[PDB]
Amino acid sequence: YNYLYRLFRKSNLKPFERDISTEIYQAGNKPCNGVAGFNCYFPLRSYSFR
Amino acid sequence: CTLKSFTVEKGIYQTSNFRVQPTESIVRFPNITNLCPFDEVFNATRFASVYAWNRKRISNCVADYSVLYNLAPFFTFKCYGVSPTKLNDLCFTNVYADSFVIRGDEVRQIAPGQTGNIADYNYKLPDDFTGCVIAWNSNKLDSKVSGNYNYLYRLFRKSNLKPFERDISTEIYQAGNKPCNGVAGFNCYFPLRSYSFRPTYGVGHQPYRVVVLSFELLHAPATVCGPKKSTNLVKNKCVNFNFNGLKGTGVLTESNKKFLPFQQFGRDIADTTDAVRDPQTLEILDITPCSFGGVSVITPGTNTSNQVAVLYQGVNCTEVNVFQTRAGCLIGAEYVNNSYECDIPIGAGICASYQSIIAY
Amino acid sequence: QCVNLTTRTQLPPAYTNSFTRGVYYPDKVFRSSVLHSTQDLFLPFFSNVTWFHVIKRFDNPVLPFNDGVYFASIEKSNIIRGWIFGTTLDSKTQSLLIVNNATNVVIKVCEFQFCNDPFLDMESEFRVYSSANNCTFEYVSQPFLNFKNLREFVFKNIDGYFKIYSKHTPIDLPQGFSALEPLVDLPIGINITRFQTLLALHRSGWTAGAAAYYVGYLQPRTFLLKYNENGTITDAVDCALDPLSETK
Numbered sequence: 001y002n003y004l005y006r007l008f009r010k011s012n013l014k015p016f017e018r019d020i021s022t023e024i025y026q027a028g029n030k031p032c033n034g035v036a037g038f039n040c041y042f043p044l045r046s047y048s049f050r
Numbered sequence: 051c052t053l054k055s056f057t058v059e060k061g062i063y064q065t066s067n068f069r070v071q072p073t074e075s076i077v078r079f080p081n082i083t084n085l086c087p088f089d090e091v092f093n094a095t096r097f098a099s100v101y102a103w104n105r106k107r108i109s110n111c112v113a114d115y116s117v118l119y120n121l122a123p124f125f126t127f128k129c130y131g132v133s134p135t136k137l138n139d140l141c142f143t144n145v146y147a148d149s150f151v152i153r154g155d156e157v158r159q160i161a162p163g164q165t166g167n168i169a170d171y172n173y174k175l176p177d178d179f180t181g182c183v184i185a186w187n188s189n190k191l192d193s194k195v196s197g198n199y200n201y202l203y204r205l206f207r208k209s210n211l212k213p214f215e216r217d218i219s220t221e222i223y224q225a226g227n228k229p230c231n232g233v234a235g236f237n238c239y240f241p242l243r244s245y246s247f248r249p250t251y252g253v254g255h256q257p258y259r260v261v262v263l264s265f266e267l268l269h270a271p272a273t274v275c276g277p278k279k280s281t282n283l284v285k286n287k288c289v290n291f292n293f294n295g296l297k298g299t300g301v302l303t304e305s306n307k308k309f310l311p312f313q314q315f316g317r318d319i320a321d322t323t324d325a326v327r328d329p330q331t332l333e334i335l336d337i338t339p340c341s342f343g344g345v346s347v348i349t350p351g352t353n354t355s356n357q358v359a360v361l362y363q364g365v366n367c368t369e370v371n372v373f374q375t376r377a378g379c380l381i382g383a384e385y386v387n388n389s390y391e392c393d394i395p396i397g398a399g400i401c402a403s404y405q406s407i408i409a410y
Numbered sequence: 411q412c413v414n415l416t417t418r419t420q421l422p423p424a425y426t427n428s429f430t431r432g433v434y435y436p437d438k439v440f441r442s443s444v445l446h447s448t449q450d451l452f453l454p455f456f457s458n459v460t461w462f463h464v465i466k467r468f469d470n471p472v473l474p475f476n477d478g479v480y481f482a483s484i485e486k487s488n489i490i491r492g493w494i495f496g497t498t499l500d501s502k503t504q505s506l507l508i509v510n511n512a513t514n515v516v517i518k519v520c521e522f523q524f525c526n527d528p529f530l531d532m533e534s535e536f537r538v539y540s541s542a543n544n545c546t547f548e549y550v551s552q553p554f555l556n557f558k559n560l561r562e563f564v565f566k567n568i569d570g571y572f573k574i575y576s577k578h579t580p581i582d583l584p585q586g587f588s589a590l591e592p593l594v595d596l597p598i599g600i601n602i603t604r605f606q607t608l609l610a611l612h613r614s615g616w617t618a619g620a621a622a623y624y625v626g627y628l629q630p631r632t633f634l635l636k637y638n639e640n641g642t643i644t645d646a647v648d649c650a651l652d653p654l655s656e657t658k
């Protein structure tokens with residue numbers, strides 16, 4: 001589980017652009033305020049490599 | 051810049067094109083109607099047991115998922131193989147809604163690659179499952195103080211379930227070597243056991259209602275496609291329009307053209323799209339192209355002076371030392387009622403000369 | 411339920427001239443004061459169109475769909491109620507049913523076990539199919555409907571999309587021009603090769619009301635369409651009919 005990918009972001013990246021910001025994503029109308037909850041997910045999820 | 055030289059000889063040069071630059075983007079799609087029957091699936095009074103899990107096919111409608119997120123009781127929204135955010139964008143051929151009721155600690159078993167009583171004997175998802183699973187607590191609907199004995203599950207089965215397979219059989223499970231012959235007892239068990247729901251149970255045993263949305267794409271045209279983003283309509287300004295996939299830039303004005311009820315787009319003599327019908331509002335709008343003009347620069351030699359005049363061809367002077375000619379609007383030259391020989395030709399009997407720049 | 415009709419009178423089907431009928435709007439695009447050339451599935455001008463009568467005559471054969479169908483109905487009292495489309499017209503394949511009963515217009519796509527002689531019969535007796543097992547699509551729509559009415563329909567099955575074009579005219583076939591407006595765009599995605607129309611009997615045995623229908627087939631060709639100031643098609647030229655129209 002050491003390899004993680006950015007599942008959620010507000011906008012598409014530019015070419016040769018790296019995003020390492022571990023900020024929460026607002027997936028719904030309701031703001032998340034930096035706290036996980038309903039439709040508030042961590043953007044980086046790990047691959048289940050077996 | 052146009053002439054690729056730093057010295058400009060005396061004359062009139064067509065150099066540029068006046069354009070009203072686009073300011074906003076206006077994207078419209080048809081009104082979201084014919085709502086998929088999610089009210090019959092999620093807000094039903096009485097679901098089915100997990101062994102006889104209820105499957106409803108969903109097609110030829112528009113599915114919105116923002117209904118589900120606005121209810122705070124729907125606690126579990128876990129989705130595999132598709133983005134939950136792109137559920138209204140990516141769209142599919144058929145949607146299968148599987149509804150059942152389990153207990154609290156078996157919601158984890160509703161996932162690809164899980165094991166348990168529900169996964170192997172009641173409800174199995176494939177390893178490549180593309181869809182969402184939704185679960186919520188239902189103490190106030192499915193628990194009874196005397197006990198709810200109308201919810202059943204399969205505890206015993208000879209072999210594991212295939213994905214999206216049901217078994218409603220009540221055949222007696224033979225666990226031993228003696229034949230059961232339909233009578234229960236020792237090494238002969240009835241396969242269906244009751245989910246005796248009571249409101250005073252712990253949270254892992256309280257009843258949870260689960261709806262599994264499974265999305266499939268086939269060779270058929272994908273006729274289940276959710277809401278499309280629409281913004282407000284702005285008229286009389288040069289904006290970027292996009293109606294039903296058809297994109298462009300133009301000024302959307304009121305139209306006097308009476309369309310027949312079946313027509314959407316409009317073409318002129320030159321086969322250019324000049325009329326349209328807004329998807330949300332059944333009004334006819336003319337798409338007048340943004341006010342294009344040829345910008346011609348009237349100048350003497352740069353050796354003599356750097357003063358210039360600008361001719362906007364075929365543009366009225368109110369739509370851009372201002373003079374109106376039949377060629378267009380001339381700005382920067384002062385009309386003189388005297389007549390001289392033609393030095394720089396403007397057109398329609400108008401000529402320009404340097405003495406400031408005069409037009410006559 | 412099915413009922414065999416054994417009281418028919420043997421007669422060969424007739425043929426007549428199409429004149430300038432069968433024209434429809436090629437697309438959903440408005441055009442004003444222009445002439446536009448289109449290469450579409452059209453019915454040729456002055457073509458040989460099959461003529462069937464309902465008078466004891468009860469004409470309900472099953473015809474090949476080909477690439478498109480023009481159906482003309484010289485109708486009074488609304489005897490003709492709908493059509494059947496499919497490949498084998500049984501439960502083996504999937505079939506499309508179009509009906510308009512006394513109340514509402516119903517479109518269904520199911521695997522119907524069709525009768526050999528399906529018909530309609532106050533109207534309270536429906537004998538069209540015996541079973542419908544796998545239904546994939548349903549669509550409920552508005553009522554479509556001396557001889558007084560000319561009903562013109564064009565059916566096309568292109569790219570799995572079934573297009574119904576319709577026109578109603580207050581009235582052999584009349585000689586004139588009437589453009590068919592597009593009525594139904596249907597997403598079926600099924601193969602159609604054969605069709606059969608549905609009639610309504612009158613019971614007092616049974617009596618057939620006076621009606622006539624015409625079946626024509628569409629071929630790929632170019633038409634020169636004339637659009638007026640209001641965007642209504644008023645005239646057309648068949649480019650492959652005669653050298654004068656080819657010059658036009």
Ligand SMILES: *[C@@H]1O[C@H](CO)[C@@H](O[C@@H]2O[C@H](CO)[C@@H](O)[C@H](O)[C@H]2NC(C)=O)[C@H](O)[C@H]1NC(C)=O
Pocket residue numbers: 412413414526527
């Ligand atoms: C009406 O007549 C048709 C044609 O004669 C009947 O269709 C046949 O019915 C027999 C019944 O044994 C079948 O074996 C044939 O295969 C049928 N033919 C076709 C082409 O399907 C029809 O059954 C008759 N209707 C009723 C109610 O008997």
Ligand SMILES: *[C@@H]1O[C@H](CO)[C@@H](O)[C@H](O)[C@H]1NC(C)=O
Pocket residue numbers: 088089092093117118121
């Ligand atoms: C169920 O009922 C609630 C009660 O307010 C409602 O808001 C919701 O739209 C209904 N439908 C679904 C699918 O949740």
Ligand SMILES: *[C@@H]1O[C@H](CO)[C@@H](O)[C@H](O)[C@H]1NC(C)=O
Pocket residue numbers: 081330331332
């Ligand atoms: C579509 O939405 C508009 C927006 O107000 C509404 O006025 C209209 O009644 C809706 N329906 C149709 C068929 O235009």
Ligand SMILES: *[C@@H]1O[C@H](CO)[C@@H](O)[C@H](O)[C@H]1NC(C)=O
Pocket residue numbers: 425426458
């Ligand atoms: C129409 O077809 C029939 C047979 O198919 C033929 O006898 C008849 O002459 C044809 N009529 C015309 C006008 O071509």
Ligand SMILES: *[C@@H]1O[C@H](CO)[C@@H](O)[C@H](O)[C@H]1NC(C)=O
Pocket residue numbers: 497498601602603
């Ligand atoms: C449609 O059906 C006919 C016979 O009914 C068959 O010959 C043809 O190949 C079929 N076409 C397609 C695209 O399946």
Ligand SMILES: *[C@@H]1O[C@H](CO)[C@@H](O)[C@H](O)[C@H]1NC(C)=O
Pocket residue numbers: 511512513514516
């Ligand atoms: C017409 O058909 C529809 C669909 O089967 C049905 O609901 C309706 O009752 C029918 N009308 C009559 C008068 O039988």
Ligand SMILES: *[C@@H]1O[C@H](CO)[C@@H](O)[C@H](O)[C@H]1NC(C)=O
Pocket residue numbers: 543544
């Ligand atoms: C079509 O119907 C038959 C019998 O009613 C059934 O066995 C078959 O599974 C159905 N096909 C589909 C795709 O559901």
Ligand SMILES: *[C@@H]1O[C@H](CO)[C@@H](O)[C@H](O)[C@H]1NC(C)=O
Pocket residue numbers: 638639640
């Ligand atoms: C076009 O419409 C106008 C107004 O609706 C009408 O006066 C005119 O006669 C129409 N043109 C034709 C050719 O019918």
